[PDB]
Design an enzyme around this catalytic site. Structure first.
Site, PDB file in Angstrom:
ATOM      1  N   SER A  46       3.038  -4.521   3.348  1.00 63.40           N
ATOM      2  CA  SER A  46       3.737  -5.713   2.884  1.00 63.40           C
ATOM      3  C   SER A  46       4.862  -6.152   3.819  1.00 63.40           C
ATOM      4  CB  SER A  46       4.252  -5.529   1.483  1.00 63.40           C
ATOM      5  OG  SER A  46       3.222  -5.233   0.550  1.00 63.40           O
ATOM      6  N   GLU A 145      -6.699  -6.257   0.601  1.00 65.01           N
ATOM      7  CA  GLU A 145      -7.456  -5.467   1.565  1.00 65.01           C
ATOM      8  C   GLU A 145      -6.623  -5.118   2.802  1.00 65.01           C
ATOM      9  OE1 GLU A 145     -11.546  -4.519   0.963  1.00 65.01           O
ATOM     10  OE2 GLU A 145      -9.779  -3.887  -0.188  1.00 65.01           O
TER      11      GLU A 145
HETATM   12  B1  4D6 Z   1       2.608  -4.134  -0.046  1.00 68.90           B
HETATM   13  O1  4D6 Z   1       1.981  -3.275   0.818  1.00 68.90           O
HETATM   14  O2  4D6 Z   1       3.872  -3.651   0.015  1.00 68.90           O
HETATM   15  C1  4D6 Z   1       4.837  -3.891  -1.018  1.00 68.90           C
HETATM   16  C2  4D6 Z   1       5.936  -3.043  -0.414  1.00 68.90           C
HETATM   17  C3  4D6 Z   1       7.179  -2.649  -1.181  1.00 68.90           C
HETATM   18  O3  4D6 Z   1       7.655  -1.506  -0.948  1.00 68.90           O
HETATM   19  O4  4D6 Z   1       7.674  -3.495  -1.962  1.00 68.90           O
HETATM   20  C4  4D6 Z   1       4.295  -3.387  -2.335  1.00 68.90           C
HETATM   21  C5  4D6 Z   1       3.022  -4.167  -2.659  1.00 68.90           C
HETATM   22  C6  4D6 Z   1       1.974  -4.103  -1.538  1.00 68.90           C
HETATM   23  N1  4D6 Z   1       1.142  -2.937  -1.787  1.00 68.90           N
HETATM   24  C7  4D6 Z   1       0.231  -2.949  -2.765  1.00 68.90           C
HETATM   25  O5  4D6 Z   1      -0.254  -4.000  -3.187  1.00 68.90           O
HETATM   26  C8  4D6 Z   1       0.012  -1.625  -3.473  1.00 68.90           C
HETATM   27  C9  4D6 Z   1      -1.341  -1.242  -3.961  1.00 68.90           C
HETATM   28  C10 4D6 Z   1      -1.711  -0.351  -4.959  1.00 68.90           C
HETATM   29  C11 4D6 Z   1      -3.133  -0.221  -5.090  1.00 68.90           C
HETATM   30  C12 4D6 Z   1      -3.799  -1.000  -4.191  1.00 68.90           C
HETATM   31  S1  4D6 Z   1      -2.716  -1.859  -3.231  1.00 68.90           S
END
Ligand code: 4D6
EC number: 3.5.2.6
Length: 267
Positions: A46, A145
């Site tokens: 993210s 993804e």
């Molecule tokens: B993303 O990668 O990063 C965000 C980072 C943060 O520390 O706030 C959190 C949401 C995103 N990651 C996901 O969507 C987590 C998942 C859980 C299962 C599949 S993806």
């Protein structure tokens, strides 16, 4: 001396957590830097959302977009991890608010909506970073993804150095005019997801703006930060980590410790 002793400390730290730690840090006053695995590939997770928000701001500055324009998505099947957009599904959100929701809460709905309507998809995101002179950053996929973080996969990766550089150009340089730069900075300062990372590494009286990522696989997590110590020029800190197995969890403490070490190295 400082540089090589910090390298050993990171190396010991990466052994302790059984993974890889990538670091780049800049003291923007003195110009001293520190890099550990700074040119190796790490998954963005993210953390690219911080740059997405800045891409939106640049489009606003160029008057291609209005920060106040309503963005509606009432029929959308909202992506997992959309804490902000989920609640406003009924009434829509301003473009500005949706961008800062992507930044400050890592909202997945906000991220995909903006990329589909305003930024030209991952290709368009990548084009934005090219345009600031960032040649390592690449976004290949959409939420969620892009988070798979499979060892060896170069999709949706950058290097700590490139992330550091690009953040420096965006938060402190002249990509964004004065007014829009100030909004970006305020957005970074109010990030909510980074309490346990770089923010935990610094004195309570330093001001921090940051953006995290947490891929949720292969213990892959990161944080990048702009830091305003009280009496001095700002620092840029960029910390990325991976781990060996799919089931391995990320480590906030390792990111915070890596930051501690990096800050010392440049201080
Ligand atoms: B993303 O990668 O990063 C965000 C980072 C943060 O520390 O706030 C959190 C949401 C995103 N990651 C996901 O969507 C987590 C998942 C859980 C299962 C599949 S993806």
């Amino acid at each position: 001396n400082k540089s090589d002793a910090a390298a050993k400390q990171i190396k010991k730290l990466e052994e302790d957590f059984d993974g890889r730690i990538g670091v780049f840090a800049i003291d923007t006053g003195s110009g001293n830097t520190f890099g550990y695995r700074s040119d190796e590939r790490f998954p963005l997770c993210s953390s690219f959302k911080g740059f997405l928000a800045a891409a939106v701001l640049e489009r606003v500055q160029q008057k291609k977009l209005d920060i106040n324009q309503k963005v509606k998505y009432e029929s959308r099947d909202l992506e997992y991890h959309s804490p902000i957009t989920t609640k406003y599904k009924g009434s829509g959100m301003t473009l500005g608010d949706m961008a800062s929701a992507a930044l400050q809460y890592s909202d997945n709905g906000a991220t995909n909506i903006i990329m589909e309507r305003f930024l030209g998809g991952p290709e368009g995101m990548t084009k934005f970073m090219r345009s600031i002179g960032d040649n390592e950053f690449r976004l290949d996929r959409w939420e969620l993804e892009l988070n798979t973080a499979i060892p060896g996969d170069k999709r949706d990766t950058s290097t700590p150095k490139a992330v550091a550089n690009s953040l420096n150009k965006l938060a402190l340089g002249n990509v964004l005019n004065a007014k829009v730069k100030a909004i970006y900075q305020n957005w970074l300062k109010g990030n909510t997801t980074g309490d346990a990372r770089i923010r935990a590494s610094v004195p309570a009286d330093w001001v921090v703006g940051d953006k995290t990522g947490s891929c949720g696989a292969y213990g892959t997590a990161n944080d990048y930060a702009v830091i305003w110590p009280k009496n001095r020029a700002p620092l840029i800190v960029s910390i990325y980590t991976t781990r060996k197995s799919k089931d391995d969890k990320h480590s906030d403490k390792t990111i915070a410790e890596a930051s501690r070490i990096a800050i010392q190295a440049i201080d």
